[PDB]
RNA sequence: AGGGCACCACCAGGAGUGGAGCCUGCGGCUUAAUUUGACUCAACACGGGGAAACUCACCAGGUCCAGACACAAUAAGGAUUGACAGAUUGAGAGCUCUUUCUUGAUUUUGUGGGUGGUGGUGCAUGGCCGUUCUUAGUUGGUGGAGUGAUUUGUCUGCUUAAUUGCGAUAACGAACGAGACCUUAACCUACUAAAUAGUGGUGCUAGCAUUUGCUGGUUAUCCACUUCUUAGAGGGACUAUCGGUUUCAAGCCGAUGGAAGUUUGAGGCAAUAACAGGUCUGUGAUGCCCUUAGACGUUCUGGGCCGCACGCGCGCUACACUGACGGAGCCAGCGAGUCUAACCUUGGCCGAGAGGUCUUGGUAAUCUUGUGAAACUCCGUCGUGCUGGGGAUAGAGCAUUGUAAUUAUUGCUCUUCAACGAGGAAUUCCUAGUAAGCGCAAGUCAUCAGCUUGCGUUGAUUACGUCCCUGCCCUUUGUACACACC
């Protein structure tokens, strides 16, 4: 259904600005840790991105680890409209 | 914004679950484990509960 | 019209004295009697599974000339690459 | 900063006794060469955590049980230590598998 | 942090058993054999026994920055208070965990069981072990299940030296 | 099910040009999101005011 | 057919169970549903299964999509969303209608492909576990027999808990299993010590009776010690020694010593081969099949698992005087426990009681807790009467937990006071701190134990045997059986 644009961006920015997201297999939690949006939203935005490539999903004791792929981050640059290939997001970012 | 969708989950078998497999029955609650009685026997030796006598 | 809990108090033949007059059926003195397991070895599917389907997945005794003489070779080649990747080059 | 007794206690809790009494020996060996007075490794009773489960995952078979046991061994060593040189030689080489806590007191 | 020693030791035994299965799943195709967690003040460091270490570190810290961010977010470690280290399994043909994952990538990649089992049994013997036994059970083009032991060497089945000497 | 969504112009204003100045009634109020809500039957659709809304137009 | 073995077999006995009342599980019956799995040992207080909601799978009804992704329409003249109040509804579900706002490629509608499922198939399976079998069995090297499959080793006898050994020997010398090993209990006046354990003085007090007995208190407002306790490292037992018997073996028995002479007691581990043993309903173990929006998904409200002519299983309470009651004496051991939040609770106060309230100690060798536990002991009351035994059923009130106690959650106080006078046929467990009586902690737990896993208190009878019954094993014989008497 409708997950609004200001909720999908704040999922997508954080996956660019962290590079991994963890979540819990517990719906109706309604606020993710470190993201200002629902735990339903972060699971179903990153199950959505997993289907089109872009994110590799591991389950491992009920808690939903997601790891971004290389073709994912080049999607999120034309999506979020960043400078071209300067910021890598965010594995090699600060200490390299 | 959908009031209808929840009920109390604060005591009983449905309040807690195994942290591995989300099962309700056979759950071991000793020492804060929250692991069912079949996942514990899988994970006894790498938790530290080895078996001597 | 009355129905439900009001009709239950005035229903006839409901209650212990009415049921005590009615005798006990012989279905109450029965059991499963092995739950149809007296023919467990004699399979009820009826396959008698073929020689080819068991020999071609689970190994055949006529190919053990070819079986281990390659499994020695890759295991030796696995040694031959494990020592080669230790600290060579 | 000048050689004052601080009345510190190091409690050492660990599942495995050989690695535990390794550090409880080295705490003795460190304070027997700085000539510090100490109440030694006091051997608290071993905590035995027993868990009894049925062997079978389903409910079939004879009624057979395990007892999975975790043993917790614990020691504490009391010290009266010049703090800056002793904290220098205790915070180094912290042992994995042994939990060590350092508590000072005002007595 | 005001928690009992019966609880704090078990919770650390659970944090170990969770990362054992997490790194089993995530580091399956890189020869994970074990994890070793060292509880020190001001940092805990995660030691990963991965046989092919060179891709666990990835390129330029990728796949080791990622597992650093993964474990610090599930277990809510503070940023920089946990670090992960990958060191390779020496005496690799005497580890059952690395050899069970090795046979797994024999059988899924399309190699027969007698060639896979005698491949890893005689790798164990040529890597210097007293005994080895591979038991494969399941179904392979036949409906009825069968089991076959591929045993070469010398094993001891009874007593404490099972715990002393045998990797299963 | 839901609304037909008639291909509407601006509603609940009378006109702009008709002889000879602006004719727009219902002088401005304290609701910013001044604005016309849904009037069904001597009641209006309270959508913005979080706690207090004491007006029954 | 022969020979062995085992209180899951008997002997000699103990304690029961089967008879009665309840508790619980199963079948059946009933029902909207009474979810189910499991049916000789190896189904039936078993699924850790003590279900008010959840669990939950079942039943009666209501939501939602949590239908990824690709493609085509629909759209920015708005694809779609969420609502005020009323109707509607158990419902304060905009579920859906009236109403007219809001909203903005996040969707809607189809075709594929997924997701989910405590849905099916344990006869497709992994893993786990049960049984054979806690049994002693299993295998290769060289040599011998045989054309060969195979066989001898790996055995006639004696012994062992044991294919444990001795011995005989066409075998010799070994390996897995047994054993060794690991854990726990029993010893250590020998070491290492300790205000998170004690003991002794008394630094130092301070009491009661007295003239020292019983105490209470402080470890830079003391000192010393480790017997008691703890737990590190060690030692000890190896049937030691001596007799008797044996083929002077392997062993076994007795005596003495010894903490221990039953594998020192007891467990953990436990081979080869399996079973169509159970579990798909423990898992994000999984193949295939079924369903996927009018759902077998998920969630919400209520019911059901507990429904009762009845057959069966494990139990709990008794039939009393070796006993009930009242008073008094009064003694354990294994656990567990909260701020990563409401756990174990001392003390004081209020109350017959249940419990309430104000505080406290404890993340625990520190506080609950000396768990001042129950049987037991003594002194009273009863006096062989279904009795003051028994407390089933049932009525009335007060509390606790919980959103919610009705079909009584449980406890409490009064009342009612049923069968049951030691139990046909049969049947279970058991050889020393063992049976049995007794209760305590833990598990599940918000509440609920007649349940289980332990733990300690009290502590006997009977045998140290046998193949008689049952079950299993080995050898010989038979076979037209090898999906192997299903
Ligand atoms: Mg269950
Ligand atoms: Mg061998
Ligand atoms: Mg052995
Ligand atoms: Mg043994
Ligand atoms: Mg008898
Ligand atoms: Mg009875
Ligand atoms: Mg029923
Ligand atoms: Mg079935
Ligand atoms: Mg039970
Ligand atoms: Mg329900
Ligand atoms: Mg499933
Ligand atoms: Mg379901
Ligand atoms: Mg041989
Ligand atoms: Mg030969
Ligand atoms: Mg033979
Ligand atoms: Mg002592
Ligand atoms: Mg089967
Ligand atoms: Mg079957
Ligand atoms: Mg739902
Ligand atoms: Mg039931
Ligand atoms: Mg039963
Ligand atoms: Mg008395
Ligand atoms: Mg005590
Ligand atoms: Mg009477
Ligand atoms: Mg209940
Ligand atoms: Mg209890």
Sequence spans of domains, chain A: 1-96
The CA–CA distances, whole Å, from C82 to B50, E123, E128, E152 equal 35, 10, 13, 21
* Alpha-carbon torsion, ordered A5, A11, A16, A20, to 10 deg: -160
**How many CB atoms within 10 Å of residue E151?**
14
Q: How far is CA A72 from the centre of its chain?
A: 10
How many residues are present in chain D? Answer: 107
Strands E82-87 and E43-50, bridge-based pairing: parallel
Residues in a beta bridge with D9:
D78, D103
Structure-token pair, residue D31: 């304070």
Exposure string of D38-56, with b = 16+ CB inside 10 Å and e = fewer, is beebeeeeebebebebbee
Cis omega (within 30 of 0) for bond into A90? yes
CA D33 distance to own-chain centroid: 21
User: Cα(A14)–Cα(C78) distance, rounded to whole angstroms?
Assistant: 44
Distances (CA, A) of F26 to A49, B33, F22, F34, F44: 49, 66, 13, 8, 14
Given the candidates 3.40.50.300, 2.60.40.10, 3.50.50.60, 3.30.300.20, the CATH classification of the domain at E7-84 is: 3.30.300.20
Spell A81-94 as b/e; 16+ CB within 10 A means b: eeeeeeeebbbeee
Residue E105 φ then ψ, to 5°: -85, 0
Nearest-10 crossing angle of helices E5-26, E66-74: 140
Q: How many Å separate Cα D24 from the centre of its chain?
A: 7
Residue F31 contacts residue F53 (beta carbons within 8 Å): no
For residue B28, say whether its CB is under 7 Å from any atom of strand G.
Answer: yes
Mark the binding-site residues of B for Zn(2+), compressed into ranges.
18, 21, 36, 39
CA separation for the pair E34, E21 (Å, rounded): 10
Determine contact, residues B35/B46, Cβ cutoff 8 Å.
no
> What token pair was written down for A5?
């644009």
Structure tokens at A84: 């071209």
* Nearest by Cα to E35 from E94, E95, E101, E85: E85
> In this complex, which of B5, B6, B19 lies closest to A61 when CB atoms are compared?
B19
**Residue E70 sits at the chain D interface (C-beta within 8 Å):** no
| Nucleotides in chain G near protein beta carbons (<7 Å) | 27-29, 37-40, 42-44, 46-49, 52-56, 62-70, 77-85, 91-93, 95-108, 118, 123-131, 175-184, 192-196, 220, 230-233, 266-279, 281-285, 299-301, 308-311, 334-340, 363-365, 402-403, 442-447, 452-454, 483-484, 486
In the block, residue with structure tokens 């007698």: E114
Q: Measured between alpha carbons, how far is B25 from B39 in angstroms, rounded to an integer?
A: 12
Q: E134: which 2 tokens?
A: 């591979």
Structure-token pair, residue C85: 């990747």
Distance CA E75, CA E84 (A): 14
The kind and range of the H/E element at E36 are strand E32-40
Dist CA E138 CA E108 (whole Å): 14
Q: Is C82 near chain E, with CB under 8 Å?
A: yes
Asked whether the bond before B16 is cis by omega within 30 degrees of 0, the reply is no
Residues 6+ apart with CB under 8 A from D11: D74, D75, D76, D100, D101, D103
How is D39-83 classified by DSSP, letter by letter? EEEEEPPPEEEEEEEESSSSS-SS--EEEEEEEEEEEEEEE--BH
**For B30 and G397, how far is CA from C1' in angstroms?**
40
């Amino acid at each position: 259904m409708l997950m609004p644009k200001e909720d999908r961006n704040k999922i997508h920015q954080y996956l660019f600005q962290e590079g991994v997201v963890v979540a819990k297999k517990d719906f109706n939690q309604a606020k993710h840790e470190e993201i200002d949006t629902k735990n339903l939203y972060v699971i179903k935005a990153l199950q959505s991105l997993t289907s089109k490539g872009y994110v590799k999903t591991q389950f491992s004791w009920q808690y939903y680890y997601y790891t971004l792929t290389e073709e994912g981050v080049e999607y999120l640059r034309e999506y979020l409209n960043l400078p071209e290939h300067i910021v890598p997001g965010t594995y090699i970012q600060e200490r390299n | 914004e959908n009031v209808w969708f929840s009920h109390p989950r604060r005591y009983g078998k449905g309040s807690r679950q195994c942290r591995v497999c989300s099962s309700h029955t056979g759950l071991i609650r000793k020492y804060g484990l929250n692991i069912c009685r079949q996942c514990f026997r899988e994970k006894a030796n790498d938790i530290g509960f080895n078996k001597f006598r | 019209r009355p129905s439900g809990n009001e009709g239950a108090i005035r229903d006839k033949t409901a209650g212990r004295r009415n049921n005590r007059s009615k005798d006990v059926t012989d279905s109450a003195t029965t059991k499963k009697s092995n739950t149809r397991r007296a023919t467990d070895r004699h399979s009820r599917t009826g396959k008698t599974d073929t020689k080819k389907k068991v020999n071609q997945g689970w190994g055949d005794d006529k190919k053990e000339l070819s079986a281990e003489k390659e499994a020695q070779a890759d295991a030796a080649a696995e040694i031959a690459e494990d020592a080669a990747e230790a600290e060579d080059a | 900063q000048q050689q004052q007794i601080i009345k510190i206690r190091i409690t050492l809790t660990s599942t495995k006794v050989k690695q535990l009494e390794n550090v409880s020996s080295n705490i003795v060996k460190n304070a027997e060469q700085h000539n510090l007075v100490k109440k030694g490794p006091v051997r608290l009773p071993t905590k035995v955590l027993k868990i009894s489960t049925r062997k079978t995952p389903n409910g079939e078979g004879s009624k057979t049980w395990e007892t999975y046991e975790m043993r917790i061994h614990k020691r504490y060593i009391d010290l009266e230590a010049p703090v800056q040189i002793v904290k220098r030689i205790t915070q180094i080489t912290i042992e994995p598998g042994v939990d060590v806590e350092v508590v000072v007191a005002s007595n | 942090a005001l928690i009992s020693k019966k609880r704090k030791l078990v919770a650390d035994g659970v944090f170990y058993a969770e990362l054992n299965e997490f790194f089993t799943r995530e580091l399956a195709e890189e020869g994970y054999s074990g994890v070793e967690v060292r509880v020190t003040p001001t940092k805990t460091e995660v030691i990963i026994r991965a046989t092919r270490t060179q891709d666990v570190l990835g390129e330029n810290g990728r796949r080791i920055n990622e597992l650093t961010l993964l474990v610090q977010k599930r277990f809510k470690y503070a940023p920089g208070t946990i670090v992960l280290y990958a060191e390779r399994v020496q005496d690799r043909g005497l580890s059952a965990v690395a050899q069970a994952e090795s046979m797994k990538f024999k059988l899924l990649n399309g190699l027969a069981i007698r060639r896979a089992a005698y491949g890893v049994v005689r790798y164990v013997m040529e890597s210097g072990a007293k005994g080895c036994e591979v038991v494969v059970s399941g179904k392979l083009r036949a409906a009825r299940a069968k089991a076959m032991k591929f045993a070469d060497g010398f094993l001891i089945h009874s007593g404490q030296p099972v715990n002393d000497f045998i990797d299963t | 099910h839901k609304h037909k969504a008639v291909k509407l112009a601006v509603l609940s204003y009378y006109k702009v040009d008709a002889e000879g100045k602006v004719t727009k009634l219902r002088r401005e109020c304290s609701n910013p999101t001044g604005v016309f809500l849904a009037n069904h039957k001597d009641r209006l659709y309270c959508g913005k005011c979080h706690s207090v809304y004491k007006v029954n137009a």
